[PDB]
Design a protein around this ligand. Structure first.
Ligand SMILES: [Mg+2]
Ligand SMILES: [Zn+2]
Lengths: 174, 91, 49, 124, 99, 242, 99, 182, 49, 55, 50
RNA sequence: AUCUGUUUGGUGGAACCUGAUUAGAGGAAACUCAAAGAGUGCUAUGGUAUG
């Protein structure tokens, strides 16, 4: 009447509730932008809004184009350039050699718009603003940021080359 | 509960397969398993099965499409093979 | 625990000045109020609440 | 410079003399000397044609343990070099990054848990 | 396309069954033959598998379901067409009710 | 659809609301005061078993509501629920505040706010028939003016057309909204700014929310129902927006 | 459908045996007894099987259409992969003029 | 033991009551679970044997490569182990080091063999039938579940001739023949 | 100290002896605690003891 | 509990948690309760202190 | 020449209704319902990444 | 009909293949006993104790 095949009672490391590694155990397909044709983005129109990055500031200092003057000369319209807080913190963190670039960036026509995340990663902040809103054109010279924003459908890109500025994906430059 | 299961189950099956009741009316592709709790009511301004089989144009469409599908499958299957054997054995 | 809890930085005031803060005077009567003057020339009266 | 028996003997001379307690031929070498010399040759070829990290990963040792081992060894190297240079003796030339290699490291096999040098400072 | 006329892309039609063999209907082309050989090889593959299992049976296997299953005396399995384990045959009380 | 058809009611993902499956599917809320449609919509009726009674459900028209448009476009989170308190800024009439009251049900409450007095009279009559609603016929930029009527509401909905939308939301939500509390805004781009484009308006207003300490969780555009409109769902944080 | 010889089927192991139901001959009491409804439930069952058959046919045709589209997409994708691979090889072989 | 809070965790990063570091992954109890053995001593007797084979393999490795003694003795070892059944490939001497494991010996144990030959349906079932005395190896019955049956005796595990298991097996196949009183 | 703080030129307390305001050549006015491990919470008598 | 050779550590339910390979042949057990130390003294003439919170 | 561009434009407008969801006016008749079906498990809203 | 034989729904799941798991799994009882998470409720009150 007593049982067979008994065996001493021990721990189950593959199933225990107390063990720390074993303790822890409505899709979202986002709509495409209502302000987008197939690849056109018909809702960018003058006056333009343009996000600035640190590499853009630095190369603009090194090739001597004032931000608003050269940006107006490129697009031929009026441009509101925006520095985000993580970009301003990247500049301040670059520090004592690039302080003259910081002092160019702290300009009363460069409207600073705040950002709500932890850390100071300007690439991730700019890519998320662009993915959510489709109203800013981006200004940078970084290769990785250029590639991500090229893959994003319908967001015009803008760098600095030679002397003046260069835009890529605005269908009406002329 | 398991009461009125005939009419209620036929109506639930009809709504689950509602994308075949009408040629000009198709739907978003959803896999609708039978819910846990539900209620069946009218609209204030019979049953869906009997009004559907009381409609005429839908009935004619179901007849035409069923005859087409059944002639396809019966053309494929056995009876053909008996015809072939008989055609040989005749002469 | 005081090593693990020591986190001293609290924030900054606004966007800061535009050339570099060289003079600062706190209101000796009230608690939230200070006045900071830069090398730009601009002076600012500041709420710290 | 292309005869490889002699160059293999010149490279493995330190391990041979370390586990002496002369057999340098492959047939008559035995024990830990055999193990370490075979590992050294395989390391040389893989180093010539492989990626540096996957070739030379160290073995895992906790932080204060490896730092204590490094500081003890660096003190023995400083003492050895000071003894030689004080009572003047020429020593083989080591690079500015790496450690000296002494019979302490050949007996103890400490270059598997420390390495050639300190790659963080070398990267800086 | 690239450098090909339509007369070069002509569409040659296909011939039907010779008239004197209309009993043996429908001359079979390569598509029909390849259907035939595919199906025959599928059947032969499963037959080779079942014969190799029959070879390597090992007649000492004991599974517990041998107390519920039954095997026909000729050799095939038998199976209840009823689905359950219980509905094989009624008892006298439920016969009284059902009558 | 018609006057005699039979449908199957089914619980939606959000609690409180239901789907009426048929040959075409209808968004539905349980009617509180049964037997009278407010804005003339058709309404379903089931019979449930003491003698049984006749329970009634009401259709939700998204070409009239700007919240059923969000439900049908699919919002992951809507902070209105069967037991909460909802402050409804810009409550023109029953055409949306009655559906919100049927969603929050008899346990919760809804404070409807309107300025002009003819929709005020409509709101007063409908609120007399429906007890979850308390009506306010006062200007919505003055929570200090109506502070004696509201205590610690749990979500805010906004159908305000005025171009000070973010500031009026910030005032009411600092005064009354609970911490970690749902904010639901319906932005009309043409009312807020007519010259510049709708996407620029949307980015601008989400910036104003993030400045006024509401962390936006999501943003839908509700395109087949209205043009140039948007729904922003955010969460009122007050403590560590990052 | 294929058939296995009785020797194979008789020596198959327990796990891989084939279940076979013989078409019953006599009339059992439940089949003699149970009643079926006339006319209107009959039309209900007929209408339901019509609807289910139409739905199955429509589903199969749509699925096979999309499968053909999948094959087209696979071939185009493979050609694009060929181009990408060759361009990467030329990029690397070009790069090793700088190193 | 209470899912202690954040600062408690940073001050007690290194406590664990259930898993220490000498309980080497709880490998012993895990293998005892996998092949259903009855005592801790059995796992660690097998581990002592595997340790002895592995140190012999290491010393033969440290001998010079083209040694007749080395080749002879490593071949004797691989032949012995393959004939016993523990390792499955007679060709690799880095298997002779690497793949000799307690689980290899513990699955040449007897109820594993029965369960694999499909005499039983689980390894717990095989242990029960052995304990109740249905299994014979050769002509004499085996009562110990911890019997290490080699290959050439895996050719001789059978049912004891008068068992209800054998009666049921034959009776299911419709082949009982009570002249044998099977 | 912090990377973004160059050349501190002016520093003050706060008038409740709890925070420290520092204006630096960088152009920023920052505000620190005076004892880092403290928090500006109010505390039950059990935690305060 | 101290056993034939090895000390074993059991849960509140008899679930065996550990066996101590280093505590060979003990007859006397003890526990310093502020120090969280299991002391085992044996037939080997050795005396071992094993911290039971770390292991 | 412009007939091809006219037909390409209307082809692209049909593709746009296939991709996005466009504004077809509003209701003008009585609201009969969603003729294509209500779905529960889908959320076509752009989630704000933090 | 000793007619033929298709679709739909029940019963049963073999051959190959893909996952997941494995001291085989399922169920019950409850003012039983035991560990452990998630939340809710409570004036939950000495900024320095009782003149
Ligand atoms: Mg960057
Ligand atoms: Zn940012």
């Amino acid at each position: 009447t007593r049982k067979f095949g008994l065996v001493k009672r021990t721990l189950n490391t593959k199933k225990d509730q107390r063990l720390k590694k074993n303790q822890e155990n409505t899709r979202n397909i986002p709509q495409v932008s209502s302000a987008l044709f197939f690849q056109y983005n018909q809702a960018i129109k003058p006056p333009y809004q343009v996000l600035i990055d640190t590499n853009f500031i630095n190369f603009s200092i090194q090739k001597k184009v004032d931000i608003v003057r050269g940006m107006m000369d490129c697009l031929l319209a009026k441009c509101n350039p925006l520095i985000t807080d993580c970009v301003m913190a990247e500049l301040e963190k670059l520090g004592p050699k690039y302080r003259i670039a910081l002092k160019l960036a702290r300009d009363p026509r460069i409207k600073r718009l705040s950002c709500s995340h932890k850390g100071t990663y300007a690439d991730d902040c700019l890519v998320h603003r662009v993915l959510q809103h489709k109203c800013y054109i981006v200004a940078t010279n970084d290769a990785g940021l250029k590639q991500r924003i090229r893959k994003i459908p319908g967001i015009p890109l803008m760098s600095v080359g030679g002397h003046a500025y260069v835009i890529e994906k605005l269908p009406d430059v002329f | 509960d398991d009461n009125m299961r005939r009419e209620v189950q036929r109506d639930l099956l009809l709504i689950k397969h509602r994308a075949a009741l009408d040629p000009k009316r198709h739907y978003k592709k959803q896999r609708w398993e039978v819910p846990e709790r539900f209620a069946i009511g009218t609209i204030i301004e019979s049953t869906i099965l009997e009004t559907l089989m009381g409609d005429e144009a839908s009935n004619k469409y179901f007849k035409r499409k069923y005859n087409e599908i059944q002639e396809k499958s019966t053309s494929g299957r056995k009876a053909h093979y008996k015809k072939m054997k008989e055609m040989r054995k005749k002469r | 625990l005081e090593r693990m809890f020591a986190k001293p930085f609290v924030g900054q005031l606004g966007y800061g000045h535009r050339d570099g803060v060289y003079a600062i005077a706190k209101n000796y009567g009230s608690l939230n109020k200070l006045a900071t003057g830069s090398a730009d020339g601009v002076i600012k009266y500041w709420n710290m609440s | 410079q292309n005869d490889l028996e002699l160059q293999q003997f010149l490279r493995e001379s330190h391990l041979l003399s370390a586990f002496n307690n002369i057999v340098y031929q492959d047939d008559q070498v035995i024990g830990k000397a055999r193990s370490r010399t075979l590992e050294m040759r395989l390391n040389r070829l893989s180093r010539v044609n492989g990626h540096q990290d996957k070739i030379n990963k160290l073995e895992k040792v906790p932080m204060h343990i490896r730092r204590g081992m490094i500081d003890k060894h660096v003190k023995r190297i400083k003492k050895y070099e000071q003894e030689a240079a004080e009572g003047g003796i020429v020593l083989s030339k080591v690079k500015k990054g790496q450690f000296r290699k002494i019979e302490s490291t050949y007996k103890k096999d400490i270059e598997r848990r420390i390495g050639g040098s300190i790659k963080a400072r070398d990267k800086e | 396309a690239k450098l090909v006329h339509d007369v070069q892309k002509k569409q040659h039609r296909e011939r039907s069954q010779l008239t004197s063999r209309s009993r043996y209907g429908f001359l079979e082309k390569h598509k029909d033959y390849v259907k035939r050989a595919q199906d025959f090889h599928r059947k032969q593959s499963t037959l080779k598998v079942l014969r190799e299992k029959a070879k390597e049976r090992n007649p000492d296997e004991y599974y517990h379901a041998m107390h519920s299953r039954k095997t026909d005396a000729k050799g095939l399995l038998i199976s209840s067409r009823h689905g359950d384990e219980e509905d094989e045959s009624l008892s006298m009380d439920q016969v009284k009710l059902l009558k | 659809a018609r006057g005699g058809a039979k449908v199957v009611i089914e619980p939606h993902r959000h609690a409180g609301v239901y789907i009426a499956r048929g040959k075409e599917d209808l968004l539905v809320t349980k009617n509180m005061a049964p037997g009278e449609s407010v804005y003339g919509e058709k309404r379903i009726s089931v019979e449930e078993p003491v003698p049984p009674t006749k329970v009634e459900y009401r259709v939700w028209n998204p070409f009239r509501s700007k919240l059923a448009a969000g439900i049908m476009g699919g919002l992951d989170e809507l902070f209105i629920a069967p037991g909460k308190k909802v402050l409804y800024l810009g409550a023109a009439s029953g055409t949306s505040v009655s559906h919100v009251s049927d969603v929050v049900g008899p346990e919760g409450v809804v404070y409807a706010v309107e300025f002009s007095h003819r929709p005020g009279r409509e709101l007063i009559s409908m609120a007399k028939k429906r007890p979850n609603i308390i009506p306010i016929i006062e200007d919505a930029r003055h929570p200090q003016k109506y502070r004696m009527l509201i205590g610690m509401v749990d979500c805010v909905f906004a159908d305000v057309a005025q171009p000070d939308q973010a500031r009026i939301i910030a005032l009411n939500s600092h005064m009354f909204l609970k911490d970690q509390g749902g904010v639901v805004i319906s932005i009309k781009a043409n009312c807020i700014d007519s010259t510049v484009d709708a996407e620029t308006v949307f980015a601008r207003e989400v910036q104003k929310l993030r400045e006024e300490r509401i962390k936006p969780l999501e943003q839908l555009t509700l395109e087949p129902y209205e043009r140039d409109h948007c729904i922003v769902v955010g969460r009122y944080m007050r403590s560590g927006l990052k | 459908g294929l058939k296995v010889p009785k020797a194979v089927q008789k020596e198959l192991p327990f796990k891989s045996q084939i279940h076979q139901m013989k078409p019953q001959k006599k009339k059992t009491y439940m089949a003699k007894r149970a009643v079926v409804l006339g006319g209107d439930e009959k039309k209900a069952r007929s209408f339901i099987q019509k609807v289910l058959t139409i739905s199955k046919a429509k589903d199969s045709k749509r699925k096979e259409q999309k499968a053909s589209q999948r094959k087209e997409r696979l071939k185009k994708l493979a050609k694009m992969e060929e181009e990408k691979s060759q361009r990467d090889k030329e990029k690397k072989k070009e790069y090793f003029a700088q190193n | 033991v209470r899912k202690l809070k954040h600062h408690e965790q940073k001050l007690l990063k290194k406590v664990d009551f259930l898993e220490w570091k000498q309980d080497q992954g709880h490998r012993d109890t895990q293998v005892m679970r996998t092949y259903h053995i009855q005592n801790r001593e059995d796992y660690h007797k097998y581990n002592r044997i595997c340790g002895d084979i592995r140190r012999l393999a290491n010393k033969l490795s440290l001998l010079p490569p083209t040694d007749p003694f080395r080749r002879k003795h490593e071949q004797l070892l691989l032949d012995k182990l393959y004939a016993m059944g523990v390792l499955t490939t007679k060709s690799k001497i880095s298997d002779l080091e690497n793949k000799v494991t307690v689980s290899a010996i513990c699955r040449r144990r007897l109820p594993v063999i029965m369960h694999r030959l499909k005499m039983a349906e689980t390894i717990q079932d095989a242990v029960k039938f052995i304990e109740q005395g249905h299994v014979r190896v050769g002509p004499n019955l085996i009562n110990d579940p911890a019997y290490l049956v080699t290959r050439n005796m895996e050719d001789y595990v059978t049912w004891v001739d008068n068992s209800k298991i054998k009666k049921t097996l034959l009776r299911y196949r419709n082949q009982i023949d009570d002249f044998d009183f099977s | 100290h912090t990377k973004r703080m160059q050349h501190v030129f002016q520093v003050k307390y706060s008038m409740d002896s709890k925070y420290i305001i520092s204006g630096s050549d960088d152009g920023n006015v920052r505000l620190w605690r005076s004892k880092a491990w403290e928090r500006s919470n109010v505390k039950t008598t059990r935690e305060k003891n | 509990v101290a056993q034939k050779k090895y000390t074993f550590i059991y849960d509140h339910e008899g679930t065996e948690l550990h066996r101590l390979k280093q505590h060979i042949e003990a007859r006397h057990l003890d526990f310093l309760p502020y120090h969280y130390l299991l002391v085992t003294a044996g037939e080997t003439g050795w005396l071992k202190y094993h911290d039971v919170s770390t292991g | 020449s412009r007939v091809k561009k006219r037909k390409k434009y209307q082809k692209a407008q049909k593709k746009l209704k296939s991709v996005r969801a466009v504004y077809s006016g509003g209701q003008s008749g009585v609201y009969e319902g969603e003729k294509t079906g209500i779905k529960k498990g889908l959320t076509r809203s752009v989630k704000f990444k933090n």
